[PDB]
Amino acid sequence: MNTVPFTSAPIEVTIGIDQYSFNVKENQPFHGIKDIPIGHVHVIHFQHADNSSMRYGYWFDCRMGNFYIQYDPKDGLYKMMEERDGAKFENIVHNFKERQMMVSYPKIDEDDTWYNLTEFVQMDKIRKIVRKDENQFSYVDSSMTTVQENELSDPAHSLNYTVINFKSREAIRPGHEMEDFLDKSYYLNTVMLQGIFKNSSNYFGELQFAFLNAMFFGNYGSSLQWHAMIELICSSATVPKHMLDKLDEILYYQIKTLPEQYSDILLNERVWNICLYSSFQKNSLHNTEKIMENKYPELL
Amino acid sequence: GAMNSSNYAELFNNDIKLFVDDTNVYRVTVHKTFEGNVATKAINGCIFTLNPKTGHLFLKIIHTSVWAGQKRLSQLAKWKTAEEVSALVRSLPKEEQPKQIIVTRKAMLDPLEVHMLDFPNIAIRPTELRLPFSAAMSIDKLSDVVMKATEPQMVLFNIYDDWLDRISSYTAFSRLTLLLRALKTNEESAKMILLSDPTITIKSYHLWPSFTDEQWITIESQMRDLILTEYGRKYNV
Ligand SMILES: Cn1cc(Br)c(=O)[nH]c1=O
Numbered sequence: 001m002n003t004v005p006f007t008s009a010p011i012e013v014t015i016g017i018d019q020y021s022f023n024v025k026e027n028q029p030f031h032g033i034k035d036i037p038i039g040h041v042h043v044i045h046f047q048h049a050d051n052s053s054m055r056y057g058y059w060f061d062c063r064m065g066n067f068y069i070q071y072d073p074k075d076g077l078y079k080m081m082e083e084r085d086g087a088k089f090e091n092i093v094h095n096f097k098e099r100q101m102m103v104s105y106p107k108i109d110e111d112d113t114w115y116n117l118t119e120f121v122q123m124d125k126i127r128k129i130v131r132k133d134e135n136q137f138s139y140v141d142s143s144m145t146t147v148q149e150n151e152l153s154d155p156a157h158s159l160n161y162t163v164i165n166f167k168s169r170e171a172i173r174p175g176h177e178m179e180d181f182l183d184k185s186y187y188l189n190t191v192m193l194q195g196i197f198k199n200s201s202n203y204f205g206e207l208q209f210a211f212l213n214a215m216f217f218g219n220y221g222s223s224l225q226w227h228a229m230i231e232l233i234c235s236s237a238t239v240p241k242h243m244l245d246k247l248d249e250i251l252y253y254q255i256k257t258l259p260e261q262y263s264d265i266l267l268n269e270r271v272w273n274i275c276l277y278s279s280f281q282k283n284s285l286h287n288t289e290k291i292m293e294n295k296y297p298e299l300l
Numbered sequence: 301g302a303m304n305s306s307n308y309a310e311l312f313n314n315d316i317k318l319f320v321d322d323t324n325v326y327r328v329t330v331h332k333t334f335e336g337n338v339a340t341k342a343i344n345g346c347i348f349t350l351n352p353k354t355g356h357l358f359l360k361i362i363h364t365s366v367w368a369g370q371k372r373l374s375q376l377a378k379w380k381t382a383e384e385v386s387a388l389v390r391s392l393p394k395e396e397q398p399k400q401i402i403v404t405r406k407a408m409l410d411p412l413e414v415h416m417l418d419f420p421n422i423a424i425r426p427t428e429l430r431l432p433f434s435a436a437m438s439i440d441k442l443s444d445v446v447m448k449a450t451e452p453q454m455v456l457f458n459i460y461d462d463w464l465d466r467i468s469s470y471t472a473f474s475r476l477t478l479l480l481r482a483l484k485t486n487e488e489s490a491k492m493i494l495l496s497d498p499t500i501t502i503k504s505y506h507l508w509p510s511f512t513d514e515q516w517i518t519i520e521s522q523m524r525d526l527i528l529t530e531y532g533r534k535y536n537v
Pocket residue numbers: 005006007068069070083088089092
Protein backbone atom coordinates (compact mmCIF):
# COMPACT_ATOMS: atom_id res chain seq x y z
CA MET A 1 0.00 0.00 0.00
CA ASN A 2 1.62 3.20 -1.24
CA THR A 3 1.64 6.79 -0.08
CA VAL A 4 1.55 10.27 -1.53
CA PRO A 5 3.18 12.70 1.48
CA PHE A 6 2.27 16.38 1.06
CA THR A 7 4.88 18.95 2.20
CA SER A 8 2.02 21.01 3.53
CA ALA A 9 -1.41 22.41 2.65
CA PRO A 10 -0.95 26.19 2.55
CA ILE A 11 -4.25 26.91 0.76
CA GLU A 12 -7.76 25.67 1.30
CA VAL A 13 -8.45 23.05 -1.33
CA THR A 14 -10.65 20.05 -2.02
CA ILE A 15 -8.38 17.10 -2.72
CA GLY A 16 -9.56 14.12 -4.71
CA ILE A 17 -7.91 10.72 -4.88
CA ASP A 18 -9.58 8.57 -7.49
CA GLN A 19 -13.32 8.82 -6.77
CA TYR A 20 -12.73 10.02 -3.16
CA SER A 21 -12.38 13.61 -1.98
CA PHE A 22 -12.04 15.60 1.20
CA ASN A 23 -11.78 19.21 2.25
CA VAL A 24 -8.50 20.59 3.57
CA LYS A 25 -8.63 23.97 5.30
CA GLU A 26 -6.03 26.69 4.79
CA ASN A 27 -2.88 25.54 6.62
CA GLN A 28 -4.55 22.49 8.13
CA PRO A 29 -1.89 19.97 9.28
CA PHE A 30 -2.27 17.71 6.28
CA HIS A 31 0.62 15.64 5.00
CA GLY A 32 -0.82 13.28 2.40
CA ILE A 33 -2.68 10.11 1.55
CA LYS A 34 -1.75 6.61 2.65
CA ASP A 35 -3.00 3.07 1.98
CA ILE A 36 -3.31 3.76 -1.78
CA PRO A 37 -3.98 0.36 -3.47
CA ILE A 38 -1.01 -0.68 -5.51
CA GLY A 39 -1.60 -2.21 -8.91
CA HIS A 40 -3.85 0.47 -10.34
CA VAL A 41 -3.30 3.85 -11.89
CA HIS A 42 -4.45 6.68 -9.73
CA VAL A 43 -5.37 10.31 -10.05
CA ILE A 44 -4.92 12.95 -7.40
CA HIS A 45 -6.79 16.14 -8.13
CA PHE A 46 -7.48 19.54 -6.71
CA GLN A 47 -10.05 22.29 -6.61
CA HIS A 48 -8.98 25.43 -4.81
CA ALA A 49 -11.44 26.77 -2.29
CA ASP A 50 -11.01 30.26 -3.75
CA ASN A 51 -11.17 29.53 -7.47
CA SER A 52 -13.43 26.65 -8.46
CA SER A 53 -12.07 27.47 -11.91
CA MET A 54 -9.40 24.97 -12.98
CA ARG A 55 -9.80 21.55 -11.47
CA TYR A 56 -6.40 19.99 -12.11
CA GLY A 57 -4.63 16.78 -11.09
CA TYR A 58 -1.96 14.17 -11.73
CA TRP A 59 -2.22 10.66 -13.16
CA PHE A 60 0.35 8.37 -11.59
CA ASP A 61 1.18 4.75 -10.86
CA CYS A 62 2.86 4.28 -7.49
CA ARG A 63 5.03 1.48 -8.82
CA MET A 64 6.81 3.96 -11.13
CA GLY A 65 8.41 5.98 -8.33
CA ASN A 66 8.01 7.84 -5.06
CA PHE A 67 5.85 10.93 -5.61
CA TYR A 68 4.84 13.76 -3.24
CA ILE A 69 2.79 17.00 -3.50
CA GLN A 70 4.23 20.49 -2.52
CA TYR A 71 2.30 23.74 -3.09
CA ASP A 72 4.14 26.20 -5.37
CA PRO A 73 3.21 29.78 -4.33
CA LYS A 74 4.67 31.24 -7.54
CA ASP A 75 2.66 29.10 -9.95
CA GLY A 76 -0.11 28.79 -7.40
CA LEU A 77 -0.89 25.16 -7.54
CA TYR A 78 -0.20 21.89 -5.80
CA LYS A 79 2.59 20.26 -7.84
CA MET A 80 3.42 16.60 -8.05
CA MET A 81 7.19 15.93 -7.90
CA GLU A 82 9.24 12.74 -7.66
CA GLU A 83 11.57 12.11 -4.63
CA ARG A 84 14.58 10.15 -6.09
CA ASP A 85 16.29 9.59 -2.72
CA GLY A 86 14.30 6.58 -1.53
CA ALA A 87 15.60 6.71 2.05
CA LYS A 88 13.88 10.14 2.12
CA PHE A 89 10.48 8.81 0.81
CA GLU A 90 10.54 6.29 3.57
CA ASN A 91 11.80 8.47 6.39
CA ILE A 92 9.63 11.44 5.52
CA VAL A 93 6.52 9.15 5.20
CA HIS A 94 7.12 7.15 8.35
CA ASN A 95 7.44 10.38 10.38
CA PHE A 96 4.16 11.72 8.92
CA LYS A 97 2.38 8.31 9.41
CA GLU A 98 3.73 8.10 12.95
CA ARG A 99 2.27 11.55 13.61
CA GLN A 100 -0.96 10.40 11.83
CA MET A 101 -1.16 13.49 9.59
CA MET A 102 -2.27 11.41 6.56
CA VAL A 103 -5.75 10.45 5.44
CA SER A 104 -6.43 6.83 4.47
CA TYR A 105 -7.46 5.93 0.91
CA PRO A 106 -10.83 4.62 2.08
CA LYS A 107 -11.45 1.62 -0.06
CA ILE A 108 -14.45 -0.48 0.86
CA ASP A 109 -13.33 -4.07 0.44
CA GLU A 110 -16.47 -5.14 -1.43
CA ASP A 111 -15.83 -2.19 -3.77
CA ASP A 112 -14.38 -2.81 -7.24
CA THR A 113 -15.37 0.63 -8.56
CA TRP A 114 -11.87 1.94 -9.22
CA TYR A 115 -10.70 -1.28 -10.84
CA ASN A 116 -13.77 -1.31 -13.09
CA LEU A 117 -13.22 2.31 -14.15
CA THR A 118 -9.49 1.81 -14.81
CA GLU A 119 -9.36 -1.79 -16.01
CA PHE A 120 -7.60 -1.02 -19.31
CA VAL A 121 -5.91 2.25 -18.35
CA GLN A 122 -2.12 1.97 -18.43
CA MET A 123 0.29 4.79 -17.53
CA ASP A 124 2.52 4.27 -20.56
CA LYS A 125 -0.48 5.13 -22.76
CA ILE A 126 -1.53 8.12 -20.60
CA ARG A 127 1.96 9.61 -21.03
CA LYS A 128 1.52 9.53 -24.85
CA ILE A 129 -1.82 11.32 -24.67
CA VAL A 130 -0.37 13.82 -22.14
CA ARG A 131 3.01 14.73 -23.60
CA LYS A 132 5.55 15.76 -20.94
CA ASP A 133 8.22 13.11 -20.72
CA GLU A 134 10.53 14.37 -17.96
CA ASN A 135 7.74 13.43 -15.52
CA GLN A 136 6.67 9.86 -14.70
CA PHE A 137 3.23 11.32 -13.84
CA SER A 138 0.78 13.26 -16.04
CA TYR A 139 -0.90 16.64 -15.42
CA VAL A 140 -4.43 17.30 -16.67
CA ASP A 141 -6.83 20.22 -16.04
CA SER A 142 -10.29 21.48 -16.95
CA SER A 143 -9.07 23.76 -19.76
CA MET A 144 -6.65 21.55 -21.71
CA THR A 145 -7.72 21.15 -25.33
CA THR A 146 -7.38 18.04 -27.47
CA VAL A 147 -5.31 17.59 -30.62
CA GLN A 148 -8.54 17.47 -32.66
CA GLU A 149 -10.00 20.54 -30.94
CA ASN A 150 -6.92 22.50 -32.03
CA GLU A 151 -7.54 21.39 -35.63
CA LEU A 152 -11.05 22.90 -35.60
CA SER A 153 -3.70 26.55 -29.70
CA ASP A 154 -0.62 25.38 -27.78
CA PRO A 155 0.38 21.81 -28.77
CA ALA A 156 2.60 21.06 -25.76
CA HIS A 157 -0.39 21.38 -23.41
CA SER A 158 -2.74 19.25 -25.50
CA LEU A 159 -4.56 15.98 -24.90
CA ASN A 160 -3.27 13.88 -27.82
CA TYR A 161 -6.24 11.57 -28.00
CA THR A 162 -6.68 9.42 -31.07
CA VAL A 163 -8.49 11.51 -33.66
CA ILE A 164 -11.83 9.99 -34.64
CA ASN A 165 -13.90 11.68 -37.35
CA PHE A 166 -16.77 9.89 -39.08
CA LYS A 167 -16.73 12.17 -42.13
CA SER A 168 -13.05 11.78 -42.94
CA ARG A 169 -11.11 9.87 -45.53
CA GLU A 170 -9.62 7.68 -42.80
CA ALA A 171 -13.15 6.59 -41.94
CA ILE A 172 -14.60 6.23 -45.46
CA ARG A 173 -13.25 3.82 -48.08
CA PRO A 174 -13.51 5.20 -51.64
CA GLY A 175 -16.42 3.41 -53.23
CA HIS A 176 -17.88 2.26 -49.90
CA GLU A 177 -19.10 5.76 -48.93
CA MET A 178 -22.62 4.73 -47.96
CA GLU A 179 -21.62 1.34 -46.63
CA ASP A 180 -18.89 2.70 -44.36
CA PHE A 181 -20.75 5.79 -43.10
CA LEU A 182 -23.79 3.80 -41.99
CA ASP A 183 -21.77 0.76 -40.75
CA LYS A 184 -18.44 1.87 -39.33
CA SER A 185 -17.16 -1.69 -38.73
CA TYR A 186 -14.37 -1.04 -41.24
CA TYR A 187 -13.24 2.06 -39.37
CA LEU A 188 -13.56 0.37 -35.94
CA ASN A 189 -11.97 -3.01 -36.65
CA THR A 190 -9.49 -2.42 -39.45
CA VAL A 191 -8.50 1.23 -39.12
CA MET A 192 -8.68 1.76 -35.39
CA LEU A 193 -8.43 -1.64 -33.65
CA GLN A 194 -6.05 -3.49 -35.98
CA GLY A 195 -4.35 -0.33 -37.29
CA ILE A 196 -3.97 2.32 -34.58
CA PHE A 197 -4.83 0.83 -31.19
CA LYS A 198 -3.52 -2.70 -31.97
CA ASN A 199 -6.07 -4.35 -29.65
CA SER A 200 -9.28 -3.63 -27.78
CA SER A 201 -7.55 -3.11 -24.45
CA ASN A 202 -5.68 -0.03 -25.71
CA TYR A 203 -8.95 1.22 -27.21
CA PHE A 204 -10.89 0.66 -24.02
CA GLY A 205 -8.03 2.22 -22.07
CA GLU A 206 -8.17 5.51 -23.92
CA LEU A 207 -11.98 5.45 -23.70
CA GLN A 208 -11.82 4.97 -19.93
CA PHE A 209 -9.17 7.68 -19.50
CA ALA A 210 -11.17 10.18 -21.55
CA PHE A 211 -14.23 9.56 -19.39
CA LEU A 212 -12.28 10.01 -16.21
CA ASN A 213 -10.83 13.28 -17.47
CA ALA A 214 -14.35 14.41 -18.38
CA MET A 215 -15.64 13.44 -14.95
CA PHE A 216 -12.86 14.63 -12.68
CA PHE A 217 -11.83 17.79 -14.53
CA GLY A 218 -14.93 18.56 -16.60
CA ASN A 219 -12.58 18.39 -19.58
CA TYR A 220 -14.88 19.06 -22.49
CA GLY A 221 -12.67 17.56 -25.21
CA SER A 222 -12.28 14.38 -23.19
CA SER A 223 -16.06 14.07 -23.01
CA LEU A 224 -16.17 14.47 -26.79
CA GLN A 225 -13.52 11.77 -27.11
CA TRP A 226 -15.35 9.34 -24.77
CA HIS A 227 -18.61 9.77 -26.72
CA ALA A 228 -16.84 9.43 -30.06
CA MET A 229 -15.29 6.11 -29.04
CA ILE A 230 -18.61 4.81 -27.77
CA GLU A 231 -20.38 5.96 -30.92
CA LEU A 232 -17.90 4.18 -33.23
CA ILE A 233 -18.57 0.84 -31.56
CA CYS A 234 -22.34 1.32 -31.33
CA SER A 235 -22.44 2.29 -35.03
CA SER A 236 -20.49 -0.80 -36.13
CA ALA A 237 -22.64 -3.78 -37.21
CA THR A 238 -19.68 -6.12 -36.60
CA VAL A 239 -17.89 -6.01 -33.26
CA PRO A 240 -16.18 -8.90 -31.42
CA LYS A 241 -18.60 -10.47 -28.97
CA HIS A 242 -16.09 -9.88 -26.18
CA MET A 243 -15.77 -6.18 -26.87
CA LEU A 244 -19.52 -5.67 -26.63
CA ASP A 245 -19.80 -7.49 -23.35
CA LYS A 246 -16.84 -5.64 -21.85
CA LEU A 247 -18.14 -2.32 -23.21
CA ASP A 248 -21.48 -2.88 -21.50
CA GLU A 249 -19.54 -3.38 -18.26
CA ILE A 250 -17.26 -0.34 -18.74
CA LEU A 251 -20.11 2.01 -19.46
CA TYR A 252 -22.20 0.65 -16.61
CA TYR A 253 -19.62 1.62 -14.01
CA GLN A 254 -18.98 4.97 -15.68
CA ILE A 255 -22.68 5.78 -15.62
CA LYS A 256 -22.97 4.40 -12.11
CA THR A 257 -20.13 6.57 -10.85
CA LEU A 258 -21.16 9.82 -12.56
CA PRO A 259 -22.47 12.61 -10.29
CA GLU A 260 -26.24 12.63 -10.66
CA GLN A 261 -26.12 16.42 -11.05
CA TYR A 262 -23.42 16.48 -13.77
CA SER A 263 -25.47 14.43 -16.25
CA ASP A 264 -26.63 17.54 -18.12
CA ILE A 265 -23.16 18.46 -19.42
CA LEU A 266 -21.20 15.19 -19.47
CA LEU A 267 -23.87 13.11 -21.25
CA ASN A 268 -24.58 13.65 -24.94
CA GLU A 269 -28.25 13.02 -25.67
CA ARG A 270 -27.73 12.11 -29.31
CA VAL A 271 -25.00 9.52 -28.79
CA TRP A 272 -26.77 7.76 -25.96
CA ASN A 273 -30.18 7.53 -27.59
CA ILE A 274 -28.41 6.26 -30.73
CA CYS A 275 -26.27 3.70 -28.92
CA LEU A 276 -29.12 2.40 -26.79
CA TYR A 277 -32.08 2.58 -29.16
CA SER A 278 -31.06 3.12 -32.81
CA SER A 279 -27.61 1.67 -33.33
CA PHE A 280 -26.65 -1.81 -34.42
CA GLN A 281 -25.78 -2.56 -30.76
CA LYS A 282 -29.14 -1.33 -29.33
CA ASN A 283 -29.66 -4.80 -27.88
CA SER A 284 -26.13 -5.48 -26.70
CA LEU A 285 -25.76 -3.07 -23.75
CA HIS A 286 -28.22 -4.54 -21.29
CA ASN A 287 -26.54 -3.38 -18.09
CA THR A 288 -25.70 0.07 -19.45
CA GLU A 289 -29.26 0.53 -20.78
CA LYS A 290 -30.88 -0.52 -17.48
CA ILE A 291 -28.86 1.86 -15.34
CA MET A 292 -29.37 4.70 -17.82
CA GLU A 293 -33.15 4.23 -17.89
CA ASN A 294 -33.37 4.00 -14.08
CA LYS A 295 -30.98 6.86 -13.25
CA TYR A 296 -31.44 9.38 -16.10
CA PRO A 297 -34.71 8.64 -17.91
CA GLU A 298 -34.95 12.41 -18.55
CA LEU A 299 -32.22 12.34 -21.15
CA LEU A 300 -33.89 9.66 -23.25
CA GLY B 301 -24.03 28.32 -43.81
CA ALA B 302 -27.60 27.89 -44.99
CA MET B 303 -29.13 29.76 -47.90
CA ASN B 304 -32.19 32.02 -47.57
CA SER B 305 -33.86 35.28 -48.64
CA SER B 306 -31.18 37.48 -47.08
CA ASN B 307 -28.17 36.03 -48.94
CA TYR B 308 -30.25 35.48 -52.07
CA ALA B 309 -28.07 37.45 -54.52
CA GLU B 310 -25.07 35.21 -53.85
CA LEU B 311 -26.52 32.77 -56.41
CA PHE B 312 -25.72 35.17 -59.25
CA ASN B 313 -22.19 36.27 -58.40
CA ASN B 314 -19.27 34.72 -60.28
CA ASP B 315 -18.47 31.82 -57.92
CA ILE B 316 -19.55 28.65 -59.69
CA LYS B 317 -22.30 26.93 -57.69
CA LEU B 318 -24.86 24.15 -58.28
CA PHE B 319 -28.20 23.44 -56.74
CA VAL B 320 -28.85 19.68 -56.31
CA ASP B 321 -32.45 18.51 -55.97
CA ASP B 322 -33.15 14.80 -55.35
CA THR B 323 -37.01 14.87 -55.11
CA ASN B 324 -37.42 12.99 -58.42
CA VAL B 325 -34.57 10.51 -58.06
CA TYR B 326 -36.63 7.64 -56.58
CA ARG B 327 -40.13 7.63 -58.05
CA VAL B 328 -42.78 4.97 -57.52
CA THR B 329 -46.30 4.13 -58.51
CA VAL B 330 -48.15 2.37 -55.67
CA HIS B 331 -50.65 -0.37 -56.59
CA LYS B 332 -52.59 -3.36 -55.27
CA THR B 333 -51.36 -6.96 -55.65
CA PHE B 334 -53.55 -9.85 -56.72
CA GLU B 335 -53.66 -10.88 -53.05
CA GLY B 336 -54.94 -7.37 -52.13
CA ASN B 337 -51.63 -6.15 -50.71
CA VAL B 338 -49.92 -2.93 -51.75
CA ALA B 339 -46.72 -2.88 -53.80
CA THR B 340 -44.67 -0.17 -55.45
CA LYS B 341 -43.32 -0.24 -58.98
CA ALA B 342 -40.48 2.19 -59.56
CA ILE B 343 -40.32 4.43 -62.61
CA ASN B 344 -37.36 6.25 -64.05
CA GLY B 345 -36.12 9.24 -62.09
CA CYS B 346 -33.65 12.06 -62.39
CA ILE B 347 -31.19 14.19 -60.37
CA PHE B 348 -31.82 17.93 -61.04
CA THR B 349 -28.44 19.71 -60.86
CA LEU B 350 -28.61 23.34 -61.91
CA ASN B 351 -26.18 26.27 -62.21
CA PRO B 352 -28.48 29.21 -61.32
CA LYS B 353 -26.10 31.68 -62.94
CA THR B 354 -25.76 30.10 -66.40
CA GLY B 355 -28.89 28.00 -66.51
CA HIS B 356 -26.91 24.85 -67.36
CA LEU B 357 -28.84 21.82 -66.16
CA PHE B 358 -27.06 18.49 -65.70
CA LEU B 359 -30.00 16.07 -65.80
CA LYS B 360 -28.80 12.66 -64.65
CA ILE B 361 -31.42 10.11 -65.54
CA ILE B 362 -31.91 7.44 -62.86
CA HIS B 363 -32.95 4.27 -64.63
CA THR B 364 -35.09 1.85 -62.57
CA SER B 365 -32.44 -0.85 -63.02
CA VAL B 366 -30.33 0.94 -60.41
CA TRP B 367 -32.86 -0.21 -57.79
CA ALA B 368 -32.89 -3.94 -58.68
CA GLY B 369 -32.12 -6.12 -55.67
CA GLN B 370 -31.69 -3.11 -53.39
CA LYS B 371 -33.21 -2.43 -49.97
CA ARG B 372 -34.13 0.86 -48.28
CA LEU B 373 -34.48 2.65 -51.57
CA SER B 374 -35.44 6.07 -50.20
CA GLN B 375 -32.15 6.10 -48.26
CA LEU B 376 -30.09 4.58 -51.06
CA ALA B 377 -31.40 7.25 -53.43
CA LYS B 378 -29.80 10.05 -51.41
CA TRP B 379 -26.48 8.18 -51.58
CA LYS B 380 -26.91 7.43 -55.29
CA THR B 381 -27.61 11.16 -55.84
CA ALA B 382 -24.42 11.99 -53.95
CA GLU B 383 -22.35 9.46 -55.96
CA GLU B 384 -23.67 10.89 -59.26
CA VAL B 385 -23.07 14.54 -58.26
CA SER B 386 -19.58 13.61 -57.08
CA ALA B 387 -18.92 11.79 -60.35
CA LEU B 388 -20.18 14.84 -62.24
CA VAL B 389 -17.80 17.16 -60.38
CA ARG B 390 -14.89 14.83 -61.00
CA SER B 391 -15.63 14.80 -64.73
CA LEU B 392 -15.56 18.58 -64.95
CA PRO B 393 -12.29 20.43 -65.57
CA LYS B 394 -10.99 22.15 -62.45
CA GLU B 395 -11.99 25.63 -63.52
CA GLU B 396 -15.59 24.32 -64.02
CA GLN B 397 -15.92 22.59 -60.69
CA PRO B 398 -18.32 24.36 -58.32
CA LYS B 399 -17.08 26.18 -55.27
CA GLN B 400 -20.43 25.48 -53.58
CA ILE B 401 -23.12 22.88 -53.89
CA ILE B 402 -26.53 23.70 -52.43
CA VAL B 403 -28.85 20.76 -51.72
CA THR B 404 -32.49 21.51 -51.65
CA ARG B 405 -33.22 18.98 -48.89
CA LYS B 406 -31.05 18.78 -45.77
CA ALA B 407 -31.05 14.97 -45.85
CA MET B 408 -28.63 15.21 -48.79
CA LEU B 409 -26.00 16.98 -46.70
CA ASP B 410 -24.25 14.01 -45.12
CA PRO B 411 -24.38 11.77 -48.23
CA LEU B 412 -22.92 14.51 -50.39
CA GLU B 413 -20.36 15.59 -47.82
CA VAL B 414 -19.08 12.00 -47.56
CA HIS B 415 -19.01 11.51 -51.32
CA MET B 416 -17.14 14.84 -51.67
CA LEU B 417 -14.40 14.25 -49.08
CA ASP B 418 -11.93 14.45 -51.98
CA PHE B 419 -13.08 18.06 -52.54
CA PRO B 420 -12.57 19.72 -49.14
CA ASN B 421 -12.65 23.16 -50.81
CA ILE B 422 -16.22 22.66 -52.15
CA ALA B 423 -18.74 23.92 -49.62
CA ILE B 424 -21.86 21.79 -49.22
CA ARG B 425 -24.76 23.99 -48.04
CA PRO B 426 -28.46 23.59 -47.21
CA THR B 427 -31.09 26.20 -47.90
CA GLU B 428 -34.17 27.52 -46.16
CA LEU B 429 -35.86 28.30 -49.47
CA ARG B 430 -38.85 26.16 -50.42
CA LEU B 431 -37.69 25.85 -54.01
CA PRO B 432 -40.03 24.21 -56.54
CA PHE B 433 -37.53 22.07 -58.42
CA SER B 434 -39.65 18.93 -57.91
CA ALA B 435 -41.92 20.33 -60.59
CA ALA B 436 -39.11 19.82 -63.16
CA MET B 437 -40.90 16.65 -64.31
CA SER B 438 -43.77 18.93 -65.30
CA ILE B 439 -41.61 20.29 -68.13
CA ASP B 440 -42.61 18.00 -70.97
CA LYS B 441 -39.25 17.54 -72.69
CA LEU B 442 -37.56 16.77 -69.36
CA SER B 443 -40.20 14.21 -68.39
CA ASP B 444 -40.00 12.79 -71.91
CA VAL B 445 -36.28 12.10 -71.88
CA VAL B 446 -36.58 10.57 -68.39
CA MET B 447 -39.45 8.22 -69.16
CA LYS B 448 -37.91 7.10 -72.47
CA ALA B 449 -34.44 6.23 -71.09
CA THR B 450 -33.47 2.58 -71.16
CA GLU B 451 -30.12 3.00 -69.48
CA PRO B 452 -28.43 5.52 -67.19
CA GLN B 453 -27.88 8.71 -69.17
CA MET B 454 -26.71 12.30 -68.55
CA VAL B 455 -28.62 14.93 -70.58
CA LEU B 456 -27.56 18.60 -70.63
CA PHE B 457 -30.07 21.44 -71.01
CA ASN B 458 -30.14 25.18 -70.57
CA ILE B 459 -33.23 25.56 -68.43
CA TYR B 460 -33.28 29.30 -69.29
CA ASP B 461 -33.42 28.72 -73.04
CA ASP B 462 -32.07 31.94 -74.52
CA TRP B 463 -33.37 34.30 -71.84
CA LEU B 464 -29.90 35.42 -70.72
CA ASP B 465 -29.57 37.26 -74.04
CA ARG B 466 -32.28 39.65 -72.79
CA ILE B 467 -32.34 39.45 -68.96
CA SER B 468 -30.04 38.84 -66.01
CA SER B 469 -29.47 35.56 -64.20
CA TYR B 470 -31.33 36.99 -61.26
CA THR B 471 -34.36 37.73 -63.39
CA ALA B 472 -34.00 34.44 -65.22
CA PHE B 473 -34.02 32.43 -61.97
CA SER B 474 -37.05 34.43 -60.77
CA ARG B 475 -39.01 33.55 -63.90
CA LEU B 476 -37.96 29.91 -63.65
CA THR B 477 -39.00 29.58 -60.02
CA LEU B 478 -42.29 31.33 -60.78
CA LEU B 479 -43.04 28.96 -63.62
CA LEU B 480 -42.09 25.92 -61.55
CA ARG B 481 -43.97 27.11 -58.49
CA ALA B 482 -47.04 27.44 -60.72
CA LEU B 483 -46.58 24.00 -62.27
CA LYS B 484 -46.27 22.56 -58.76
CA THR B 485 -49.43 24.11 -57.32
CA ASN B 486 -51.74 23.41 -60.25
CA GLU B 487 -50.08 21.64 -63.15
CA GLU B 488 -53.15 21.70 -65.40
CA SER B 489 -53.71 25.45 -65.27
CA ALA B 490 -50.01 26.37 -65.37
CA LYS B 491 -49.79 24.36 -68.58
CA MET B 492 -53.01 25.80 -70.01
CA ILE B 493 -51.41 29.21 -69.52
CA LEU B 494 -48.14 28.38 -71.23
CA LEU B 495 -49.71 27.00 -74.42
CA SER B 496 -53.05 28.82 -74.79
CA ASP B 497 -52.05 30.84 -77.85
CA PRO B 498 -50.94 28.15 -80.35
CA THR B 499 -48.93 30.74 -82.28
CA ILE B 500 -46.25 30.83 -79.54
CA THR B 501 -44.12 27.78 -80.10
CA ILE B 502 -41.31 26.03 -78.31
CA LYS B 503 -38.15 25.90 -80.39
CA SER B 504 -36.80 22.43 -80.94
CA TYR B 505 -33.69 23.34 -78.91
CA HIS B 506 -35.72 24.95 -76.04
CA LEU B 507 -37.93 23.98 -73.14
CA TRP B 508 -40.34 26.91 -72.87
CA PRO B 509 -42.28 28.96 -75.44
CA SER B 510 -40.71 31.77 -77.44
CA PHE B 511 -42.40 34.76 -75.74
CA THR B 512 -41.52 38.37 -76.43
CA ASP B 513 -40.69 40.56 -73.44
CA GLU B 514 -44.27 41.82 -73.42
CA GLN B 515 -45.73 38.34 -73.71
CA TRP B 516 -43.62 37.20 -70.74
CA ILE B 517 -44.95 39.93 -68.47
CA THR B 518 -48.48 38.76 -69.31
CA ILE B 519 -47.49 35.13 -68.76
CA GLU B 520 -45.68 35.93 -65.53
CA SER B 521 -48.74 37.85 -64.28
CA GLN B 522 -51.01 34.93 -65.16
CA MET B 523 -48.78 32.57 -63.13
CA ARG B 524 -48.90 34.80 -60.04
CA ASP B 525 -52.70 34.97 -60.24
CA LEU B 526 -52.75 31.15 -60.37
CA ILE B 527 -50.44 30.84 -57.37
CA LEU B 528 -52.41 33.33 -55.23
CA THR B 529 -55.69 31.68 -56.27
CA GLU B 530 -54.58 28.13 -55.46
CA TYR B 531 -53.50 29.60 -52.15
CA GLY B 532 -57.07 30.83 -51.72
CA ARG B 533 -58.79 27.66 -52.96
CA LYS B 534 -56.54 25.85 -50.50
CA TYR B 535 -57.09 28.14 -47.50
CA ASN B 536 -60.40 29.81 -48.48
CA VAL B 537 -59.51 33.52 -48.29
C1 LIG C 1 10.33 18.45 0.27
N1 LIG C 1 10.19 17.03 0.00
C2 LIG C 1 9.13 16.37 0.47
C3 LIG C 1 9.00 15.03 0.14
BR1 LIG C 1 7.51 14.15 0.91
C4 LIG C 1 9.93 14.29 -0.57
O1 LIG C 1 9.81 13.09 -0.65
N2 LIG C 1 11.02 14.98 -1.05
C5 LIG C 1 11.16 16.35 -0.77
O2 LIG C 1 12.06 17.02 -1.14
